[PDB]
Amino acid sequence: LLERLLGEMELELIELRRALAQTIATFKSTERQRDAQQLIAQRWYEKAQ
Amino acid sequence: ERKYLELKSQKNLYLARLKSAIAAQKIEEIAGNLDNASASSLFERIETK
Numbered sequence: 001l002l003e004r005l006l007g008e009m010e011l012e013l014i015e016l017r018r019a020l021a022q023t024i025a026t027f028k029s030t031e032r033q034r035d036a037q038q039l040i041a042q043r044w045y046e047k048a049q
Numbered sequence: 050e051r052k053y054l055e056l057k058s059q060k061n062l063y064l065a066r067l068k069s070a071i072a073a074q075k076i077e078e079i080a081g082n083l084d085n086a087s088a089s090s091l092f093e094r095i096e097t098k
């Protein structure tokens with residue numbers, strides 16, 4: 001069992017590693033998306049100047 | 050016979066308009082707008098990748 005159990009454990013860990021990366025993508029993606037909106041608002045403010 | 054021609058002289062005109070708009074719809078959906086940030090635009094899907 002010991003050999004088989006660890007093999008399953010190692011396989012699971014990389015799956016966790018892969019999944020966490022996808023979380024970072026959205027965290028970065030929305031942040032980049034957020035900057036876009038304020039830039040548009042700046043254009044109107046600059047135009048309103 | 051006189052009435053016959055007045056139809057044919059217009060049929061080619063309608064087809065041209067139909068081909069113009071149908072193609073335009075095909076182009077626009079592939080616009081790949083950068084602002085979507087949802088994978089609807091294939092470009093932003095690449096950026097997520």
Ligand SMILES: Nc1ncnc2c1ncn2[C@@H]1O[C@H](COP(=O)(O)OP(=O)(O)O)[C@@H](O)[C@H]1O
Pocket residue numbers: 082084085086087088089090
């Ligand atoms: N001024 C704009 N013009 C066009 N698209 C915009 C504008 N502002 C925001 N968007 C984008 O339009 C997208 C529409 O969302 P979504 O439903 O995912 O795309 P689709 O319309 O292709 O289904 C949003 O994700 C957003 O990023």
